[PDB]
Design a binder for this molecule. Structure first.
Ligand SMILES: CCCCCCCCCCCCCCCCCC(=O)OC[C@H](COP(=O)([O-])OCC(O)COP(=O)([O-])OC[C@@H](COC(=O)CCCCCCCCCCCCCCCCC)OC(=O)CCCCCCCCCCCCCCCCC)OC(=O)CCCCCCCCCCCCCCCCC
Ligand SMILES: CCCCCCCCCCCCCCCCCC(=O)OC[C@H](COP(=O)([O-])OCC(O)COP(=O)([O-])OC[C@@H](COC(=O)CCCCCCCCCCCCCCCCC)OC(=O)CCCCCCCCCCCCCCCCC)OC(=O)CCCCCCCCCCCCCCCCC
Ligand SMILES: CCCCCCCCCCCCCCCCC[C@@H](O)O[C@H](CO[C@H](O)CCCCCCCCCCCCCCC)COP(=O)(O)OCC[N+](C)(C)C
Ligand SMILES: CCCCCCCC/C=C\CCCCCCCC(=O)OC[C@H](COP(=O)(O)OCCN)OC(=O)CCCCCCC/C=C\CCCCCCCC
Ligand SMILES: CCCCCCCC/C=C\CCCCCCCC(=O)OC[C@H](COP(=O)(O)OCCN)OC(=O)CCCCCCC/C=C\CCCCCCCC
Ligand SMILES: CCCCCCCCCCCCCC(=O)SCCNC(=O)CCNC(=O)[C@@H](O)C(C)(C)COP(=O)(O)O
Lengths: 113, 459, 148, 171, 85, 59, 12, 128, 221, 78
């Protein structure tokens, strides 16, 4: 059971608030200054984005790093010992490419499945 | 060098003769230049300590500190120059003189060389910082604070003084190089023990020790920020520098006398950090964080293992920059709202972003995470400490716990969360603010790339 | 002014000034009391983490959740939320403690009695079934020193 | 939004009812079983003492509180807006108070001429209004009782507080 | 669902209609709840919780005490959702 | 693109159901094809008591 | 657009 | 039901179970009327402060200042020596650090006797 | 071999670039995130290759391109061991995270600051890569702790409600408690084995280590 | 572009499991006013719960067949 004065209060504030929110709305009010702007717009004049965008993007992000980092590879690996240490390949009974060699052993095993 | 030191004197005439509304630019620009000149000193040598005049030398231990000390002046200027404005021109012009006079005493007291010269400057630093704390601090308590800052230094320093004189009588010269070479052990008895404390207590006061640190928070609560940045970032560290110096003598006695101070330190670190976890107001929180880190330096010095001195150097510098950074970064809030108490700031992030970013970087390196020079500085001394006693890790680990918490805490309490409603006072971040803290934090991050020039002599 | 907290509970007739001063006259004024901890003439308030106070009320400071001049609990910060929450719990406290600590206890003892009787070894009685394998021994004798 | 008032018995037993009923859904899960036990529950409240003297009744509450507290379920369902919430304040990151925009400086303020125009209209309305709420508040109030706010009588009515809260999901 | 005032008043009555104790023809947006209709509070709690439940919206208790007129309700949700429609 | 309804849930596009059903069927097709491709739930038999002649006992 | 967002000035 | 809740320092009893919530006398109702009176007094005040155009700046509430004051400046002037606090302070003070003193010193001695009189010294530990 | 070498390091490093682009105006655009999903896509495409060179011939690699700080005796240096584990694991992370990218573009599509959110995503993943790859133990520690703090930044994303903040703080707290053990171990290997490198430590510790393993276990906890 | 509300009248309770419940309350004689609301939208329309194991076998009806095509390919390879 609200007191009537409370009722009119809540009514008044409700009206004022809807008035506020209605005031909040914007129209063609969204705006911008004119917009180097030419440094971007001139480049877009001839680009064919549907394929070319993926082109340039991939060009940078995958082509440049590998060229660079591999050049850095000739730096650090050619420069110094133990910069890169391989596990050295397993060598089975089959001949090495280094100089033939290698041999199978016994093969005394019998029966199957 | 005598070359860097003259211009530092020369700014004073320049300050006084500067046009009344241009002085900040003068002092700023030339202080930056002289910083860059200071930087050339850094080269050092891999073997012999660098030398100059008969009366100066530049050990690797001093050089990064010297570079830092030269580096701070512009920063304090950028912080100060809006904090004060309504002050009369003659008084302001009087004011920066305190700062520069101060750093002049620092550039002199780092390169030493005689330990009596080093002492007299070591104690000479006390005056300008006193004047600054007392005349330009806010609120009443600063008066009282002045006294605590003062006597705790002198009561420590004075016996050291007499002790110094004594040695140059019991041996030849007081000079550092020869005493590094002519050094001979002092041992047990009882006279030699009092010699020990006499040559340690002053240095262990000036970088606060847990049983004696009481003046330090109560200094930082009071001092105008330009006083705070120096009182935190530098003077502590210089006390550490001197204590690293005088340990050329002593031994083997240090092996026997380290224990009590290792207890006050190893326990005081966890303790003060714990107090740090529940402050009422931020400006103190930072201060106790500072003591909580200096304890690490002081054990790092006393276990005397080379790793420990490496870590000593690194942590001294890193904590320098990060602490000063937190202070200016707190003063900004204090100016925007005059709250001081941390609770009123509340949702400061909501109303402005970039400061939240600096809060993030700064606190983030306060907790020390890799590969901050703070961290790497700290990990070494944990290593050497662990060599010294396998148990010790259980203490260090707790530190690394709490220093996380309160650090993040100061972040999440004064930022993340709701804005206070009525506090309309905030006004969207000046350029100088961002400029300033960017100036703290960038060097701190570049510096990680090249530790090898900061680790110091025992590298 | 005089608004700042004043020393010592021991103001039996002057207590009214104190109760007024913190804005809580209704003899809710509770000094800690005189004691050597040295905090005196400050209201002792019941412990209550801020969750306990009503969320739906429109507080002046909703995160702090504690309007305006209302005197603040001493250990505000420990109860500030994000810290200790002393909210009431449907199962009683001691029962909580007993159930969990007892649970971990049983968990451990059962565990270690388990450790006494490994699989493929066990208590001998069950071991009559549990026995198996042995098996593990192998390797060329060289492996005894190929690892050496 | 209807502050205070020292509490009374009826509303008390009512809130106990909505509460218990809700936890009862939290148990019964299915709309079905929940419906059944709900009807059974209200049936309990009426079948018991829907009318009685007070002194017995409070005892009946003291019974009910226990009987509830035992059955209250470790965690009730809670709507996200509610203080439990899966998102009690997810959006408080966003609700910036209006006065803060009043700071953008002209190069930004130019970009929304309309909104700012309307806004100065408002701020004008307030600064014009305020003395009236002063005199009225001064008027309707006795020394100053438990009640909060007071009715409009000819204009305005302490409105700036509520009317310009930053809605609910600003972003 | 950007939602509108008509949608609120409509969905609300659309729930009040289904409640048995109300006789649907007598229902009106302004129709009173106790002085008109004998539903009493013990059922009032039902209609309010069941009604908020439709939205997933939550009703604070002291505001639940007022309630009564359905228009007061649609007003209330209009405030909390800030529809301004 | 979809409308709220108030009970109907206008389950847009058959293609959705086509996809869902496609993956469920894809699942069973895999588990079964793999079940026929091999029975990995078994391999080689094992036994216990064996024969005393293989071991030792004498008397 | 349709409705005005509030937001602190981001210019500085 | 039977079991009954048992309140603790970390689990304060819910308000619904508090006996004081029930028994109620008109003077106690005057207590609630009073509490609402002062609470309404102050909140009315805070609203008069909160929103008139001319304030602009922050307005700190006095109670918070009494608190921050009482978390620092007021602690010492009171104090009082009391044997409970004094002994408790000696305990938390000198105690644990003596504890650590023995705990480190023994280990040090142990490593001493192993490095010297013994020969269990670590190898490779050339870093130092 | 060599192509494998350039390969893995590329399958890491390209991830860094968008963060760099974070100061570029494209970051301020709505357009940014799809460059990120595409970025992880290329990252994965590249990421498969080392696994296959790892397949049929089975080779494994360590590189330590640049010493960072030469101490006495010890000279720690960043070193990306690329064993079975580290090679196999990367495509997985790239894969699922790429799916998370595409998901998040829709889950958050209403949300402001979404671009920042993606920035934090990549920023997290890269630290994860720091952890899985690192040979030198210290580098494992930077990957460790950094992943921890990214966890903190993301848990608190809805920073308004307190519960998010407590959750974040809670996570950093227990992680830190683990970090104590991590540091204990990390010191002990240096004091004893004199190392901080998996080569050193695997080599010199045929003897039983009675204690470092348990603290390291706590860190694992 | 508001969607219309369906209908007040149309939500019959008779087909619902809930009707059984109202019967059970009728055994108590108790009245359960809300059911026509609760049951309407949920149980009473599209609702017709899918079997659990049947839900698990959502793809089996086609998968077994494509599998038959697969083994058919097996014999075809023979
Ligand atoms: C070592 C120190 C020895 C004693 C010197 C104490 C300085 C006292 C002082 O400056 O009080 C001014 C100031 C008086 O206030 P004021 O109203 O501005 O007085 C007007 C000025 O005195 C008068 O203002 P002015 O603008 O008319 O005076 C101009 C003058 C400034 O003249 C002065 O005011 C002081 C003169 C400096 C004496 C230098 C001593 C030796 C160095 O500027 C100069 O040119 C200084 C000489 C630099 C040329 C050297 C070129 C060499 C190449 O004192 C204060 O109010 C604050 C000081 C509080 C205590 C701190 C004192 C020491 C710090
Ligand atoms: C090494 C040890 C460092 C330990 C802590 C480093 C934390 C770095 C950081 O906080 O970055 C802020 C950045 C926050 O961005 P925000 O909060 O969205 O800033 C919003 C503002 O609109 C500001 O965002 P914005 O994008 O508009 O600002 C762009 C601005 C600022 O840059 C950024 O906003 C992006 C920062 C990328 C973080 C890089 C992580 C490693 C440093 O970029 C620049 O203009 C700088 C230009 C180049 C200056 C370099 C001078 C050197 C000579 O990211 C983080 O908070 C990183 C969290 C910690 C990561 C742990 C990594 C451990 C490994
Ligand atoms: C670096 C960290 C510092 C840690 C803490 C520093 C020292 C704390 C311990 C303080 C030492 C003792 C002083 C404490 C007060 C004693 C004097 C007096 O004020 O205390 C009386 C009461 O205190 C007790 O009588 C004294 C107990 C003292 C025992 C503690 C000593 C612990 C040893 C500490 C180490 C000592 C240093 C040795 C070198 C390592 C109260 O006076 P009063 O009210 O009028 O009369 C008594 C009232 N009666 C009759 C009702 C009882
Ligand atoms: C009331 C409050 C104020 C009171 C404060 C109390 C301070 C007490 C300090 C104690 C002072 C002791 C004075 C004695 C010093 C002394 O004996 O020096 C002698 C000794 C040798 O003399 P010789 O004649 O050459 O004999 C050697 C050949 N036969 O002199 C020296 O070599 C060095 C002189 C330095 C003396 C300075 C010592 C004072 C240092 C203060 C230490 C304070 C302790 C702090 C403890 C904190 C640790 C947790
Ligand atoms: C006992 C003696 C010491 C034991 C404690 C060890 C270290 C404790 C560190 C305490 C500092 C933390 C202070 C700040 C924490 C804080 O304020 O957060 C509050 C928050 C409470 O809210 P929550 O319920 O968690 O979340 C939602 C609640 N609405 O709690 C936290 O976030 C902090 C949680 C840290 C708990 C510390 C305990 C960790 C140690 C336990 C592991 C041991 C396992 C059992 C050992 C038995 C083995 C036989
Ligand atoms: C799962 C949780 C389980 C919860 C278990 C709850 C069981 C409770 C048992 C029943 C106890 C009671 O019924 S207590 C209330 C009885 N007291 C009275 O009726 C006092 C007189 N006052 C009233 O009747 C008013 O409050 C009414 C009900 C509003 C009057 O009805 P009208 O619609 O206004």
């Amino acid at each position: 059971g609200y007191t009537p004065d409370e009722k009119l209060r809540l009514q008044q504030l409700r009206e004022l608030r809807r008035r506020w929110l209605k005031d909040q709305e914007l129209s063609p009010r969204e705006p911008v200054l004119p917009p180097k702007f030419l440094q971007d717009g001139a480049p877009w004049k001839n680009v064919i984005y549907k394929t070319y965008r993926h082109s340039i993007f991939a060009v940078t992000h995958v082509l440049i790093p590998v060229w660079i980092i591999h050049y850095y590879l000739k730096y650090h690996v050619t420069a110094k010992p133990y910069t890169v240490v391989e596990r050295k390949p397993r060598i089975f009974p089959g001949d090495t490419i280094l100089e033939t060699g290698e041999v199978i052993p016994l093969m005394k095993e019998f029966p199957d499945q | 060098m005598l070359k860097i030191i003259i211009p530092t004197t020369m700014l004073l005439p320049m300050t006084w003769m500067s046009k009344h509304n241009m002085i900040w630019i003068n002092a700023t620009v030339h202080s930056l230049l002289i910083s860059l000149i200071s930087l050339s000193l850094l080269n050092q040598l891999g073997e012999n300590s660098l030398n100059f005049s008969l009366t100066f030398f530049s050990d690797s231990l001093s050089a990064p500190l010297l570079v830092l000390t030269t580096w701070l002046l512009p920063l304090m200027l950028m912080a100060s120059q809006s904090h004060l404005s309504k002050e009369t021109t003659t008084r302001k012009k009087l004011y920066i003189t305190m700062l520069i006079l101060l750093q002049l005493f620092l550039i002199m007291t780092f390169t030493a060389t005689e330990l009596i010269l080093f002492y007299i400057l070591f104690e000479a630093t006390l005056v300008p910082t006193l004047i600054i704390i007392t005349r330009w601090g806010n609120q009443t308590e600063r008066l009282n604070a002045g006294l605590y800052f003062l006597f705790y230094t002198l009561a420590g320093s004075l016996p050291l003084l007499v002790a110094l004189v004594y040695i140059q009588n019991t041996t030849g010269s007081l000079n550092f190089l020869i005493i590094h070479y002519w050094s001979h052990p002092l041992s047990n008895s009882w006279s030699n023990i009092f010699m020990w404390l006499a040559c340690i207590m002053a240095f262990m006061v000036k970088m606060p020790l847990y049983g004696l640190h009481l003046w330090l928070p109560k200094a930082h609560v009071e001092a105008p920020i330009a006083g705070s940045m120096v009182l935190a970032a530098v003077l502590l560290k210089l006390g550490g520098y001197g204590m690293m110096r005088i340990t050329t003598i002593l031994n083997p006695l240090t092996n026997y006398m380290a224990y009590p101070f290792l207890m006050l330190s190893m326990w005081g670190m966890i303790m003060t950090s714990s107090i740090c976890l529940r402050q009422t107001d931020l400006k103190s929180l930072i201060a106790y964080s500072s003591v909580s880190h200096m304890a690490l330096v002081i054990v790092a010095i006393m276990i005397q293992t080379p790793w420990s001195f490496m870590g000593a150097t690194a942590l001294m510098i890193a904590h320098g920059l990060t602490s000063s950074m937190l202070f200016c970064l707190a003063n900004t809030n204090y100016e925007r709202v005059h709250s001081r108490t941390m609770i009123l700031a509340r949702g400061l992030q909501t109303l402005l972003p970039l400061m939240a970013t600096w809060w993030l970087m700064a606190s983030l390196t306060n907790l020390a995470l890799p590969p901050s020079i703070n961290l790497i500085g700290e990990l070494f001394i944990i290593t050497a400490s662990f060599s010294w006693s396998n148990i010790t890790i259980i203490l260090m680990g707790m530190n690394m716990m709490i220093t996380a918490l309160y650090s993040l805490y100061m972040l999440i309490t004064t930022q993340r969360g709701k804005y206070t409603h009525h506090i309309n006072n905030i006004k969207a971040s000046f350029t100088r603010e961002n400029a300033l803290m960017a100036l703290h934090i960038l060097p701190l991050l570049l510096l990680t790339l090249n530790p090898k020039m900061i680790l110091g002599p025992l590298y | 002014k005089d608004m700042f907290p004043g020393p010592y509970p021991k103001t039996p007739e002057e207590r009214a000034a104190a109760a007024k001063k913190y804005n809580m006259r209704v003899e809710d004024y509770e000094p800690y009391p005189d004691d050597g901890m040295g905090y005196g003439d400050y209201p002792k308030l019941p412990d209550r983490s801020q969750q306990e106070r009503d969320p739906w009320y429109d507080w002046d400071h909703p995160d702090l959740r504690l309007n305006w001049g209302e005197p603040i609990h001493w250990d505000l910060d420990m109860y500030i939320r994000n810290r200790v929450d002393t909210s009431p719990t449907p199962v009683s406290w001691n029962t909580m403690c007993k159930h969990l600590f007892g649970f971990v206890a049983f968990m451990l003892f059962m565990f270690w009695v388990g450790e006494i009787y490994p699989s493929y070894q066990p208590v001998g009685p069950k071991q009559y079934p549990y026995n198996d394998l042995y098996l593990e021994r192998g390797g060329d004798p060289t492996k005894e020193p190929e690892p050496v | 939004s209807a502050p205070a008032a020292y509490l009374t018995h009826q509303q008390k037993v009512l809130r106990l009812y909505k509460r218990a009923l809700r936890h009862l859904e939290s148990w019964c899960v299915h709309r079905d079983k929940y419906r059944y036990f709900a009807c059974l529950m209200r049936a309990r409240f009426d079948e018991h003492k829907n009318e009685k003297d007070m002194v017995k009744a409070t005892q009946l509450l003291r019974q009910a509180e226990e009987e509830f507290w035992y059955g209250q379920h470790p965690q009730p369902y809670i709507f996200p807006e509610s203080p439990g919430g899966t998102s009690y304040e997810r959006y408080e990151c966003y609700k910036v108070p209006e006065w803060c925009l009043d700071d953008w400086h002209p190069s930004e303020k130019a970009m929304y001429p309309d909104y700012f125009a309307k806004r100065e209209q408002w701020k004008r309305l307030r600064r014009e209004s305020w003395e009236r709420e002063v005199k009225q508040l001064q008027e309707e109030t006795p020394p100053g009782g438990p009640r909060t706010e007071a009715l409009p009588p000819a204009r305005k009515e302490l409105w700036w507080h509520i009317v310009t809260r930053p809605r609910e999901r600003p972003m | 669902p950007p939602l509108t005032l008509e949608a609120i008043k409509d969905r609300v009555l659309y729930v009040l209609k289904l409640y048995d104790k109300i006789d649907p023809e007598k229902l009106s947006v302004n129709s009173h709840f106790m002085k008109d209709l004998g539903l009493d509070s013990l059922d009032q709690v039902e209609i309010i919780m069941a009604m908020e439940d439709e939205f997933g919206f939550e009703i604070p208790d002291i505001d639940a005490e007022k309630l009564m007129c359905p228009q007061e309700i649609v007003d209330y949700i209009a405030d909390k959702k800030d529809v301004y429609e | 693109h979809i409308e709220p309804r108030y009970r109907q849930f206008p389950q847009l596009t058959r293609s959705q159901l086509i996809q869902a059903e496609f993956f469920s069927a894809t699942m069973w097709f895999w588990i079964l094809w793999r079940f026929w491709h091999d029975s990995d739930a078994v391999l080689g038999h094992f036994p216990y008591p064996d024969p005393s002649q293989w071991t030792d006992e004498e008397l | 657009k349709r409705l005005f967002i509030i937001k602190p000035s981001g210019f500085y | 039901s039977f079991p009954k809740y048992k309140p603790s320092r970390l689990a304060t009893l819910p308000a619904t179970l508090d006996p004081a919530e029930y028994d109620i006398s008109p003077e106690t109702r005057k207590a609630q009327a009073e509490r609402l009176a002062i609470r309404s007094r102050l909140k009315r005040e805070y609203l008069l402060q909160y929103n008139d155009p001319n304030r602009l700046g922050v307005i700190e509430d006095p109670a918070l200042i009494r608190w921050t004051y009482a978390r620092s400046a007021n602690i010492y002037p009171n104090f009082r020596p009391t044997p409970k606090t004094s002994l408790l302070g000696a305990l938390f003070g000198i105690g644990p650090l003596f504890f650590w003193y023995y705990v480190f010193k023994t280990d040090r001695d142990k490593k001493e006797k192993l490095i010297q009189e013994g020969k269990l010294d670590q190898t490779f530990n050339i870093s130092y | 071999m060599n192509p494998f070498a350039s390969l893995t390091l590329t399958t890491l490093i390209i991830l860094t670039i968008p963060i760099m682009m974070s100061n570029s105006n494209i970051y301020k655009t709505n357009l940014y995130p799809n460059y990120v999903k595409t970025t992880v896509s290329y990252a994965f495409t590249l990421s498969l290759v080392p696994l296959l060179m790892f397949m049929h011939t089975g080779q494994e690699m360590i590189i330590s391109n640049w010493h960072w700080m030469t101490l006495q005796t010890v000279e720690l240096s960043l070193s990306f061991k690329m064993d079975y584990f580290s090679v196999m694991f990367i495509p997985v992370a790239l894969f699922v995270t790429w799916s998370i990218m595409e998901f998040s573009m829709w889950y958050m599509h209403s949300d402001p600051f979404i671009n920042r959110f993606f920035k934090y995503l990549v920023l997290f993943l890269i630290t994860m890569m720091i952890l899985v790859t690192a040979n030198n133990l210290f580098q494992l520690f930077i990957g460790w702790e950094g992943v921890g703090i990214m966890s903190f930044l993301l848990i608190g994303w809805w920073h308004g409600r307190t519960d998010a903040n407590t959750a974040a703080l809670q996570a950093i707290l227990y992680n830190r408690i683990g970090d104590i053990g991590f540091v204990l171990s990390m010191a002990w290997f240096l004091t004893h084995s004199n190392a901080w490198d998996l080569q050193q430590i695997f080599m010199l510790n045929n003897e039983c280590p009675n204690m470092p393993l348990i603290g390291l276990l706590l860190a694992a906890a | 572009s508001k969607m219309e509300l369906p209908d007040y009248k149309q939500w019959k309770i008779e087909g619902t499991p809930l009707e059984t419940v109202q019967e059970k309350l009728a055994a108590r004689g108790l009245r359960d006013p809300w059911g026509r609301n609760e049951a309407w939208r949920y149980s009473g329309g599209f609702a017709n719960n899918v079997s659990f194991v049947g839900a698990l076998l959502k793809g089996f009806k086609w998968g077994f067949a494509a599998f038959v095509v697969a083994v058919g390919a097996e014999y075809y390879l023979e």
